[PDB]
Amino acid sequence: DPTFIPAPIQAKTSPVDEKALQDQLVLVAAKLDTEDKLRAAMVGMLANFLGFRIYGMHSELWGVVHGATVLSPTAVFGTLASLYLGALDHTADRLQAILGVPWKDKRLDAHKVLSALQAVQGLLVAQQLLLSTVVGVFTAPGLHLKQPFVQGLALYTPVVLPRSLDFTELDVAAEKIDRFMQAVTGWKTGSSSVDSTLAFNTYVHFQGKMKGFSLLAEPQEFWVDQSTSVSVPMLSGMGTFQHWSDIQDQFSVTQVPFTESASLLLIQPHYASDLDKVEGLTFQQKLSPRTIHLTMPQLVLQGSYDLQDLLAQAELPAILHTELNLQKLSNDRIRVGEVLNSIFFELEAEVLEVTLNRPFLFAVYDQSATALHFLGRVANPLS
């Protein structure tokens, strides 16, 4: 098997063309057979199962996230399926158990899974909606990457950027990865031992234009607490949006569509203190139409988390720091520094007045692939 040393992160890199990536993602969904389409929905449903498994083993899950408290079940499921591509023996087996894909072995068919995740990506944007995923494989200087592994990540996303980097100076390493990712994407990012020789980071950007809405001129006060308050630019739209008021669990849900299959969900607790408990009831394994005038904050959010913290209860840190065998990734010594997910989430522009001027929960769902693309919590629209 041939190899190659990732170019040093300081080398010239042309920026990624998102509009060219979107055309590719739509092409992927366009040429999907019936079996591949069901496989995409299947993997979207399986990523949800993993996501719900992550909310059950976390009382306060959001101390894991740096910045905006947004979470991508599809990206977490893809980062694990991507690492499995380079795993062997015990490491591969333990990763396979976490994914729980009920398909016949080709070991798990990592190529079919990753190609299914890119399918749920293309299904969403093929309907205004912008979803982009790029993977950065950051390695110590001189570490040899195996070609079949890099080429298989391209099944997850056409944009794969392997670069070599000096991890000895660590605080500078985190700046170079951010200064590199922002220079090549134009987004905002965040990141965080000295033995490390590999950092496998997924960076995804979502931009959702809701039609029928508009950015109001004057801001409105957003109450982070009953004591503290901040003014925020607000979106405003009116239409027949699905809704439901849960009197038993005292919370209300609003579903405003993006497309025929993709929608945004908004869980508003009746009282502010119920936020963490209302979250437990919703994010875990009934709406009807109503004329609603929705007013919610314009969301320009950025956050990041290490899967080793999300899946600490699944012993992922042990999977990646004990008996490690990523020898399909590289023959050289691998010490995982971070397994990152960095999310740039943008939400931009008789009667029931629904106003999100208090902490709320949200989610982006797509019925095409029955996939929770994003779960999140907005205690403060500004960060």
Swiss-Prot record:
Q: What is its main location?
A: secreted
| UniProt KW Methyltransferase keyword | no
What does the UniProt keyword field contain? Disease variant, Disulfide bond, Glycoprotein, Secreted, Signal, Vasoactive, Vasoconstrictor
What GO CC terms are in its UniProt record? blood microparticle; collagen-containing extracellular matrix; extracellular exosome; extracellular region; extracellular space
Q: Which Gene3D superfamilies match?
A: Alpha-1-antitrypsin, domain 1, Antithrombin, subunit I, domain 2
* Pfam family of the protein (one): Serpin
Q: List glycan-bearing residues.
A: Q226, Q250
- The source organism is Homo sapiens (Human)
Provide the free-text tissue specificity comment from this protein's UniProt record: Expressed by the liver and secreted in plasma.
Any one GO molecular function term: type 2 angiotensin receptor binding
Which GO terms are recorded in the biological process aspect for this UniProt protein? angiotensin-activated signaling pathway; blood vessel remodeling; cell-cell signaling; G protein-coupled receptor signaling pathway; G protein-coupled receptor signaling pathway coupled to cGMP nucleotide second messenger; kidney development; low-density lipoprotein particle remodeling; maintenance of blood vessel diameter homeostasis by renin-angiotensin
Q: Identify the gene encoding this protein.
A: AGT
Q: What is the effect of changing T168I?
A: Risk factor for hypertension
Q: What InterPro entries does the record point to?
A: Angiotensinogen (IPR000227), Angiotensinogen_serpin_dom (IPR033834), Serpin_CS (IPR023795), Serpin_dom (IPR023796), Serpin_fam (IPR000215), Serpin_sf (IPR036186), Serpin_sf_1 (IPR042178), Serpin_sf_2 (IPR042185)
Q: How does it assemble?
A: During pregnancy, exists as a disulfide-linked 2:2 heterotetramer with the proform of PRG2 and as a complex (probably a 2:2:2 heterohexamer) with pro-PRG2 and C3dg.
**Could you state what the record's PTM comment says about this protein?**
The resulting peptide form, angiotensin-A, has the same affinity for the AT1 receptor as angiotensin-2, but a higher affinity for the AT2 receptor. In response to low blood pressure, the enzyme renin/REN cleaves angiotensinogen to produce angiotensin-1. Angiotensin-1 is a substrate of ACE (angiotensin converting enzyme) that removes a dipeptide to yield the physiologically active peptide angiotensin-2. Angiotensin-1 and angiotensin-2 can be further processed to generate angiotensin-3, angiotensin-4. Angiotensin 1-9 is cleaved from angiotensin-1 by ACE2 and can be further processed by ACE to produce angiotensin 1-7, angiotensin 1-5 and angiotensin 1-4.
PROSITE patterns, per the entry: SERPIN
User: What family does the database annotate?
Assistant: Belongs to the serpin family.
Q: This chain belongs to which protein, by name?
A: Angiotensinogen
What outcome is documented for mutating T133M in this protein?
Answer: Risk factor for hypertension
What this protein is reported to do is described as:
Essential component of the renin-angiotensin system (RAS), a potent regulator of blood pressure, body fluid and electrolyte homeostasis.
